[PDB]
Amino acid sequence: IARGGEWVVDLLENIRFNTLHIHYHTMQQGNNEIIRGEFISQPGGAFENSSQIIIRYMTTG
Amino acid sequence: DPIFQPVQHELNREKIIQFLSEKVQYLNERQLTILDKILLPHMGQTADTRVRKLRFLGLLIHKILLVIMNVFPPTDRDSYRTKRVHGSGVSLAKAFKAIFNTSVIAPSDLNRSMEQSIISQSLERKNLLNTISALRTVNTHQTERADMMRRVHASYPGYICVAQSADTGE
Amino acid sequence: YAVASYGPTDALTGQPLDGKRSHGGLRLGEMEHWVLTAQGAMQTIIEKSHDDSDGCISYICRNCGEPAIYNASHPIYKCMNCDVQADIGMVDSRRSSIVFQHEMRAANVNITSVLSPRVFQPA
Amino acid sequence: MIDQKIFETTLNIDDPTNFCTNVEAHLLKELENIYVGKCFKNSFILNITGVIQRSPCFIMRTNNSGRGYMHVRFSAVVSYLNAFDLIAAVKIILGESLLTEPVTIVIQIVPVQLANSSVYYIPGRQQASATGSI
Amino acid sequence: MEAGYAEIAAVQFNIAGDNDHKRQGVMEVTISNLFEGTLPAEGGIYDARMGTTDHHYKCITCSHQRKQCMGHPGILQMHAPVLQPLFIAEIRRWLRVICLNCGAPIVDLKRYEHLIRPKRLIEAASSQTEGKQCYVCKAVHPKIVKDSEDYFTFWADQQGKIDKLYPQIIREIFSRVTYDTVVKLGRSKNSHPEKLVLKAIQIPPISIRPGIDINNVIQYLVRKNLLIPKDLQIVRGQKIPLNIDRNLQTIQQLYYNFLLDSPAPSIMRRLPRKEGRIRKSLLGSQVWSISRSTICGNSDLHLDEVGYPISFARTLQVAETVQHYNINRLMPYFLNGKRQYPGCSRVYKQITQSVHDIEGLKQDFRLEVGDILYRDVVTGDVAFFNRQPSLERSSIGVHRIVVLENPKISTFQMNVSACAWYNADFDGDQMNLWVPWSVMSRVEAELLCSVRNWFISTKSSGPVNGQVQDSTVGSFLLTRTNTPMGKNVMNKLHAMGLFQTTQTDPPCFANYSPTDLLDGKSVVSMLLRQTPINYQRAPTWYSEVYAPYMHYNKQDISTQIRNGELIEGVLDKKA
Amino acid sequence: ESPSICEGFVQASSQTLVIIPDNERITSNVLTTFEATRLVAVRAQQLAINGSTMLKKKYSSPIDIAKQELFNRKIPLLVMRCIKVTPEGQKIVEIWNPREMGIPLLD
Amino acid sequence: MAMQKLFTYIYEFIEYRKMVLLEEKVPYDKFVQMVLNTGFFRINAETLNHGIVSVFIFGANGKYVHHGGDMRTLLTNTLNEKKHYEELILIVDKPVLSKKNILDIIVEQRAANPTIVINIYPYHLFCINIPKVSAIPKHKLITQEEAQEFLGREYLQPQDLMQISASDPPVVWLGGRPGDFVQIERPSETAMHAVVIRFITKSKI
Amino acid sequence: YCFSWPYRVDMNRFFQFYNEMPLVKTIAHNYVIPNGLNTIVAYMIYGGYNQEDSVIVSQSFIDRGGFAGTFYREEKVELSFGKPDPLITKNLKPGANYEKLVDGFVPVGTVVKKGDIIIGKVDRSVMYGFDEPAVVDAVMRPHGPNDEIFGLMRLRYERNLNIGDK
Amino acid sequence: TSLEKAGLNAREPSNVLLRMALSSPVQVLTDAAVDSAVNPIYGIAAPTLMGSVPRIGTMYSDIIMDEKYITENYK
Amino acid sequence: CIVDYYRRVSIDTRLVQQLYGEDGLDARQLETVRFETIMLSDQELEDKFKYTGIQSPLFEEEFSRLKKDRDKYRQIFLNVENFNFSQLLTDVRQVPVNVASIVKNILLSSTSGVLPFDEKSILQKYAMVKTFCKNLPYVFINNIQERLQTPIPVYLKRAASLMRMLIRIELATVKTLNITCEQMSAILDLIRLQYTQSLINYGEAVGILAAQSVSEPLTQYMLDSHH
Ligand SMILES: [Mg+2]
Ligand SMILES: [Zn+2]
Ligand SMILES: [Zn+2]
Ligand SMILES: [Zn+2]
């Protein structure tokens, strides 16, 4: 209840943490690279700060 | 590497750390001390977890290379094995965490701004069904991606209703 | 919803407001204009987009192509560019178009309206 | 001095059915009503006598009013002035000339010689504006 | 004096310089003060000479009141020149193509002469032009670089030595350029590069900035312009003090953000996108005298009729000018007023040029010839019926109004066969309806946009309308040879009863006894005889997939019509 | 300093209306639905401002008067079809008399 | 391949152009050998106006299509011969058309001789009887008198017409110069054939 | 929609008087209150009035309370409350009733129309505006978050099933 | 030529208002100013952006009053 | 793209089409009819359309005109068939006027039945269909230029080719034996009236019509993407 109205905090669909998400950017945009394995690291619980690391293979190799 | 030309061949670790610091012995440690906290914190944030951090990073690179070798497909972006649903408790705490430092630590505004975040869904009381479905709704926030995320994924059955969705509009 | 020929207008464009909530409006968008154009109406479009919308009368000098200052009631007949040679002509327009031309001029793009020539049958 | 100058204009015809019953008479009536005694195109236009060319009574296209306009090239006698020109009688109201050329000059009856500033024929006004000396 | 009718035949686009702003402006912004209590400050950015945003005062310039006043531009004489935000790339192109010391072109004007004029300067500036020696003054052309952290500053690099090209320096450089270099580089005389640096900017008319967020940027610009010294001169290599280096930067940034930002949306961001001035305000329009409601079916309405609820019929009005030929017809409307239907609620008296509400007419019963009466919508009026999205040519059609005098009905009612024009159904669809009130628009609606003109599809050249659902299956049941009860016959009473609601002149049954039996094909032929046509085709009923099973009646599987006499076959989707 | 664009702008050469002779006209002798609709609309608006008609029959609506005037070939209007605007200032038009033209179906 | 088709259809092009050969036809083996040796094969034909049209067929690997100096030498030498020289046609590989230096020498010598028409075309322009291709409607050049009367009746300037390139294959086979008018009899699925007139504009490349 | 509907002040909330358990119920109705009615429906062609997803409804079924209910709208304005005096005159809303006002508010149980004035404020009054007439049954004066009074007038709409209702 | 922005530049380069109405009005307007473009008022989008009405079907043909007929019938 | 006074389609003044549909017809005014002569062999064409009642060179000329029209149709639409993937030649065409129906209606309304042999009428009936087909392209201009018999532009001659071909098939002497000269003059006036009523109006925004007409099938094409 706020400002005289009724509000709900929706369930947000979120990417699982501490997992590698390998992505193929296959439609050739960003042609200088097609792969990226994203990893977001959660230290000890959903409240801690998460650090995202991105590992790429480039066309250069 | 056009950006890391000088240290591409360097074995002097201190030189690497120094060049990283300028791109971003006490200063040598600090830039290395900040690194392990921001690089795979879930493995640990102390100097005794560097070996396992490196092993895990090698494993991640190995998995990406396995995918590039067509040994494995790319991770399914719509499968629910790799998804999580967050509501109320998680969503407010992260917003409270961001709001706590800027309103308390940085210097009645935190209450107002938290409420403003709450407003920025409205509980529609069409019926009891509308209420308990609005609280049972999971929200995701012209390409193949747009097609694929709207489909009935094969991981849905039993967790996401295979029928319930909007019938009109985006 | 049903609205009569009057109500709240937008301050900038002079058009009606947005629908029932604002107590005025309802929209004939791009596609409606395409349909009326394909039907070749052009007098329904005059009525709906000028008489029932932000229709207005503009004054162009015909000697410089620039908007002029004309007033029938308070006698005013002048243009800032070629004052003594003003040849002001009465051009039907819309306030949205006048605002658009003013916005173009505010970006230092000069807009001169050539105006169709006067045609005379041979003496 | 009095001279003749050819002007062009577009009239507006609020009753195109009645106007076309006698185009020349109504046309001269409207031209005299609008332009006689008013500065227009750097001249005063004392009176209108003569229509050289005219257009058909076109019906206005961009509005649903049903009105017409007509373009007119008419020949009119105009009063024009030059620098260092003499005016016989200027009445004090700032001075207003009593002759057939209505000029209000900024300096009983005093004769006036015009200055070199040239006469301002502000279009639409019932007189000219000028400066001079005695 | 009279402003004659004119039409815009062409629009000429150009770059506006200082002379344009000085000539067009009706005032100069000299003060940063906003209001003089209640009236706008004279010399402020709200000065009434620019126009009026309120009903409390007129324009001074044109003496109109907020509606006939289109607004008038003002001038802001800047103490230091500014670069026009739109033409920054043009300034950059002209900088590297012109010698800075004397204004002569450093490039060879013959080399690009053959190119098309819009490309001549682009390609001339494409060349490196660094280190080139001027022929006239033997000066080495510096390197013209762009500061990466803003959009409007130019640096001249002389082999490692760099000096910032201030707008006064650039103005002098471009003033040294002759018109011959301008025309030989493909630009018009009106595109001389000296126009690209403004010392007097145009203050927009208040018409485009009404309400008391864009005026904040104008206000900040005006006061910040006062900070700069009026006699500030900047020669090349002056090394001006830093206190005004920031101040000069913030004026140029304010002017740039005033026009090309993206807070306080700029002038040029009002144009693009779907919500911009062009697509929302110009190419579309919000209109008056229009209604919207849910549509629903009414089988008793003709295909070119629309059911208009009476509440909307009194809201929307038709303007009728009173003359001798319509005065008697318009009197019942005038006497009914708002109390009775068909009534009227407005009167415009042309002698007073004023509109009078029908309730306030003390003795105005003299509805005199020449005044305009706004009367309610009556049955038989034409109305535009539109469903969105308007994709087809028939998405807007004109229907004859049938006013539904039942006060409980609030839907737009239409025949189900008219839905094909709008691709509409009755599951919650809404359509817009507006009744033309002008004579010109009504003549047009009746003669041109009537839905009889969209019966044949423009897209496919075939018919759009026909029987749907119940009438498709009801035509088959009517015209089939046999029923489960035996032959598909009806007696004279039921044959007559089929024509009760056709709203056409009923046929003659006087040759039939009460016990005489009539086939469904016989009663259909009684109707088709009014428009005799010849048709011979197999029905949708007969199909080869069904044929191996089911007993197909021979009389049913070949639909033949000769001069409107249906003699065999059924009527279904095919027919 | 560049001059104002208004200074170097010349408005337009006034045109002369060249009317193609009646035997040289190549446009249709039948009114289009657009031209017939426009003629009826103009006539009906002018009957809203004026009231003088040549119709013997009396009608209570300007639209009906205009429609019958078009059908009965006494509409006091002409159709001018501008076919060319010549660079040396000639407006070449065909003027068609709707009373002599073929009326489209319109119904 | 391209060479035999070009050899058989360049003479069909010359005949379709209503041109008579000044020289005599050589066997195909002699033609390909001359292309391989000299780098080009030159065919000279005479028009009805006794003008000379020279056709040059450049091999893919010849010296001329690679170095602009030899192209300059050849063009300057042939253009100085004592011939009327109505036109010069140079047939090369399509990739040569994207070589900037060859285009530069072509346009330079075109400017050097304003009277002579110099044109450079790919092989596929003459590897088929273009007028006999089913998908190509019948093109024909119309005189300036027919075009003038058509434009006068239609109150049109030549610039109002639909445009066609002088390098269009049917226009090349017709020999249509820019500024000329070509009438096309196009098949129609609504009118069962139709006629348009297209204004010939400047050649591409 | 909410079992505490009369205590609550709601906007665009419809309370339907009569609800029925479905004759053919499902497991869902063990957890959500059934809303709707077990209407008798004939799947038939009747005059072509139910074509293209239209329905013919019994007028008596509407009159008897079928799908009837109350629709509620909230009017909240914030600051003095009171009927304007004739001294104001010029600033008064054009053609507004300004009557039917007691102690600055419309009394509970009064049928208000488009021209009526609800919650007089000082001109700063509030025009009803809606085309559909309403009945006022609520007049509160609660204090806002800064302990400041406001209007909070609740309007009641009696809604039977209409032609054009889905 | 295409139906995209580039096709409209090839077919109607001088119709700035039409090209502004399609997309990117600021880019088109800047090019028109530097090019000193003259936009003849024709078609549909250009007269609409100028607040006028397109000169198509009912506005395609000009109506002129029949003076000869009026003086002989209406005088 | 707007239809001008020549029924060309132009942008401002620059032509897009010499005639709007290449035939200058509104899309709402077309009927699909069959051309009988298309599939007939040479022998069965004679059996059906070669008149034998009168031994005159005119009826030899009438049949050659029929044979040439059939060959022209075949030559055009076999070529159209060639430069397409699967666009088969069809004997059915969309025409402004269904001549076969007009003849049938006139025959029905005729009080007389089988007319007796009248050589003067049959020769004169043939003459005024030959004259009518010759003057057919004047529907695209006006009756003033028809009266003066001024030249028809070539593109306007081609615009009437399909209707001239149908009139010859449907008003062939074998098909109008029972039709009087007064009836045939009424037939021809009815054909010309429906041809005039089928033409595209000046000032029609046919570019918007095409964009609207082609965009709707695009949506169905995208629906059938899964197919
Ligand atoms: Mg629907
Ligand atoms: Zn001027
Ligand atoms: Zn003003
Ligand atoms: Zn120099």
PDB file of C-alpha atoms in Angstrom, chain B residues 6-105:
ATOM      1  CA  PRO B   6      53.962  -4.391 -24.220  1.00  0.00           C
ATOM      2  CA  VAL B   7      52.963  -7.215 -21.854  1.00  0.00           C
ATOM      3  CA  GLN B   8      51.922  -9.871 -24.390  1.00  0.00           C
ATOM      4  CA  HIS B   9      55.249 -11.646 -23.811  1.00  0.00           C
ATOM      5  CA  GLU B  10      56.183 -10.371 -20.342  1.00  0.00           C
ATOM      6  CA  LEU B  11      56.807 -12.880 -17.561  1.00  0.00           C
ATOM      7  CA  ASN B  12      57.364 -10.132 -14.968  1.00  0.00           C
ATOM      8  CA  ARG B  13      54.049 -10.401 -13.129  1.00  0.00           C
ATOM      9  CA  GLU B  14      54.532  -7.008 -11.472  1.00  0.00           C
ATOM     10  CA  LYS B  15      54.766  -5.363 -14.895  1.00  0.00           C
ATOM     11  CA  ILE B  16      51.448  -6.948 -15.900  1.00  0.00           C
ATOM     12  CA  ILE B  17      49.763  -5.797 -12.693  1.00  0.00           C
ATOM     13  CA  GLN B  18      51.198  -2.294 -13.104  1.00  0.00           C
ATOM     14  CA  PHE B  19      50.041  -1.924 -16.702  1.00  0.00           C
ATOM     15  CA  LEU B  20      46.609  -3.198 -15.658  1.00  0.00           C
ATOM     16  CA  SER B  21      46.540  -0.604 -12.867  1.00  0.00           C
ATOM     17  CA  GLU B  22      47.303   2.258 -15.251  1.00  0.00           C
ATOM     18  CA  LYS B  23      44.679   0.925 -17.662  1.00  0.00           C
ATOM     19  CA  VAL B  24      42.083   0.892 -14.881  1.00  0.00           C
ATOM     20  CA  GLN B  25      54.601  -2.891  -4.158  1.00  0.00           C
ATOM     21  CA  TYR B  26      51.653  -1.670  -2.091  1.00  0.00           C
ATOM     22  CA  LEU B  27      49.999  -0.442  -5.292  1.00  0.00           C
ATOM     23  CA  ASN B  28      51.056  -3.734  -6.894  1.00  0.00           C
ATOM     24  CA  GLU B  29      49.088  -5.652  -4.265  1.00  0.00           C
ATOM     25  CA  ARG B  30      46.054  -3.352  -4.190  1.00  0.00           C
ATOM     26  CA  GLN B  31      45.259  -3.722  -7.888  1.00  0.00           C
ATOM     27  CA  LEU B  32      45.796  -7.459  -7.456  1.00  0.00           C
ATOM     28  CA  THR B  33      43.792  -7.419  -4.211  1.00  0.00           C
ATOM     29  CA  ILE B  34      40.849  -5.689  -5.885  1.00  0.00           C
ATOM     30  CA  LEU B  35      41.055  -8.131  -8.795  1.00  0.00           C
ATOM     31  CA  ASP B  36      40.306 -11.367  -6.945  1.00  0.00           C
ATOM     32  CA  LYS B  37      37.290  -9.766  -5.276  1.00  0.00           C
ATOM     33  CA  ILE B  38      35.899  -8.762  -8.688  1.00  0.00           C
ATOM     34  CA  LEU B  39      37.007 -11.947 -10.516  1.00  0.00           C
ATOM     35  CA  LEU B  40      34.895 -14.988  -9.593  1.00  0.00           C
ATOM     36  CA  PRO B  41      33.876 -13.892  -6.072  1.00  0.00           C
ATOM     37  CA  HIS B  42      31.823 -17.068  -5.596  1.00  0.00           C
ATOM     38  CA  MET B  43      35.041 -19.092  -5.465  1.00  0.00           C
ATOM     39  CA  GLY B  44      36.368 -16.798  -2.727  1.00  0.00           C
ATOM     40  CA  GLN B  45      37.720 -13.298  -2.201  1.00  0.00           C
ATOM     41  CA  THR B  46      41.070 -14.099  -0.549  1.00  0.00           C
ATOM     42  CA  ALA B  47      44.561 -14.864  -1.827  1.00  0.00           C
ATOM     43  CA  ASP B  48      44.265 -18.565  -0.917  1.00  0.00           C
ATOM     44  CA  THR B  49      41.710 -19.148  -3.707  1.00  0.00           C
ATOM     45  CA  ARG B  50      43.835 -18.030  -6.672  1.00  0.00           C
ATOM     46  CA  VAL B  51      44.738 -21.569  -7.770  1.00  0.00           C
ATOM     47  CA  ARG B  52      41.123 -22.754  -7.723  1.00  0.00           C
ATOM     48  CA  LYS B  53      40.013 -19.529  -9.413  1.00  0.00           C
ATOM     49  CA  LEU B  54      42.477 -20.247 -12.215  1.00  0.00           C
ATOM     50  CA  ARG B  55      41.330 -23.862 -12.484  1.00  0.00           C
ATOM     51  CA  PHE B  56      37.704 -22.730 -12.724  1.00  0.00           C
ATOM     52  CA  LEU B  57      38.566 -20.097 -15.335  1.00  0.00           C
ATOM     53  CA  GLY B  58      40.386 -22.749 -17.338  1.00  0.00           C
ATOM     54  CA  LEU B  59      37.300 -24.954 -17.094  1.00  0.00           C
ATOM     55  CA  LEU B  60      35.126 -22.101 -18.370  1.00  0.00           C
ATOM     56  CA  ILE B  61      37.446 -21.475 -21.322  1.00  0.00           C
ATOM     57  CA  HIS B  62      37.429 -25.222 -21.989  1.00  0.00           C
ATOM     58  CA  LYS B  63      33.630 -25.283 -22.083  1.00  0.00           C
ATOM     59  CA  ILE B  64      33.511 -22.326 -24.485  1.00  0.00           C
ATOM     60  CA  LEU B  65      36.046 -24.115 -26.700  1.00  0.00           C
ATOM     61  CA  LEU B  66      33.965 -27.296 -26.584  1.00  0.00           C
ATOM     62  CA  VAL B  67      31.002 -25.278 -27.823  1.00  0.00           C
ATOM     63  CA  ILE B  68      33.049 -23.706 -30.633  1.00  0.00           C
ATOM     64  CA  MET B  69      34.101 -27.241 -31.655  1.00  0.00           C
ATOM     65  CA  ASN B  70      30.432 -28.271 -32.080  1.00  0.00           C
ATOM     66  CA  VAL B  71      30.930 -30.834 -29.325  1.00  0.00           C
ATOM     67  CA  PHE B  72      28.102 -29.086 -27.473  1.00  0.00           C
ATOM     68  CA  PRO B  73      25.343 -26.708 -28.559  1.00  0.00           C
ATOM     69  CA  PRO B  74      25.083 -23.159 -27.216  1.00  0.00           C
ATOM     70  CA  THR B  75      23.320 -22.752 -23.898  1.00  0.00           C
ATOM     71  CA  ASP B  76      19.553 -22.632 -24.399  1.00  0.00           C
ATOM     72  CA  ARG B  77      18.447 -19.072 -23.649  1.00  0.00           C
ATOM     73  CA  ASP B  78      14.836 -20.111 -22.962  1.00  0.00           C
ATOM     74  CA  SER B  79      15.332 -23.311 -20.968  1.00  0.00           C
ATOM     75  CA  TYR B  80      14.320 -22.948 -17.337  1.00  0.00           C
ATOM     76  CA  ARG B  81      17.225 -25.027 -16.051  1.00  0.00           C
ATOM     77  CA  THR B  82      19.282 -21.828 -16.334  1.00  0.00           C
ATOM     78  CA  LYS B  83      16.573 -19.429 -15.132  1.00  0.00           C
ATOM     79  CA  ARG B  84      15.521 -18.108 -11.737  1.00  0.00           C
ATOM     80  CA  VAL B  85      12.407 -16.285 -10.542  1.00  0.00           C
ATOM     81  CA  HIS B  86      12.895 -13.383  -8.133  1.00  0.00           C
ATOM     82  CA  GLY B  87      10.141 -11.512  -6.336  1.00  0.00           C
ATOM     83  CA  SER B  88       9.642  -9.140  -3.412  1.00  0.00           C
ATOM     84  CA  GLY B  89      12.377 -10.395  -1.103  1.00  0.00           C
ATOM     85  CA  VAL B  90      15.215 -10.427  -3.622  1.00  0.00           C
ATOM     86  CA  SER B  91      14.050  -7.515  -5.775  1.00  0.00           C
ATOM     87  CA  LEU B  92      13.560  -5.053  -2.909  1.00  0.00           C
ATOM     88  CA  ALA B  93      16.756  -5.978  -1.057  1.00  0.00           C
ATOM     89  CA  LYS B  94      18.970  -5.180  -4.035  1.00  0.00           C
ATOM     90  CA  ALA B  95      17.019  -1.951  -4.489  1.00  0.00           C
ATOM     91  CA  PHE B  96      17.298  -1.293  -0.750  1.00  0.00           C
ATOM     92  CA  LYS B  97      21.026  -2.043  -0.927  1.00  0.00           C
ATOM     93  CA  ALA B  98      21.488   0.497  -3.723  1.00  0.00           C
ATOM     94  CA  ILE B  99      19.223   2.999  -1.968  1.00  0.00           C
ATOM     95  CA  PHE B 100      20.810   2.554   1.474  1.00  0.00           C
ATOM     96  CA  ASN B 101      24.263   3.872   0.560  1.00  0.00           C
ATOM     97  CA  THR B 102      23.084   6.858  -1.499  1.00  0.00           C
ATOM     98  CA  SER B 103      20.539   8.095   1.073  1.00  0.00           C
ATOM     99  CA  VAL B 104      22.215   7.147   4.371  1.00  0.00           C
ATOM    100  CA  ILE B 105      25.921   6.524   3.825  1.00  0.00           C
TER     101      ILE B 105
END
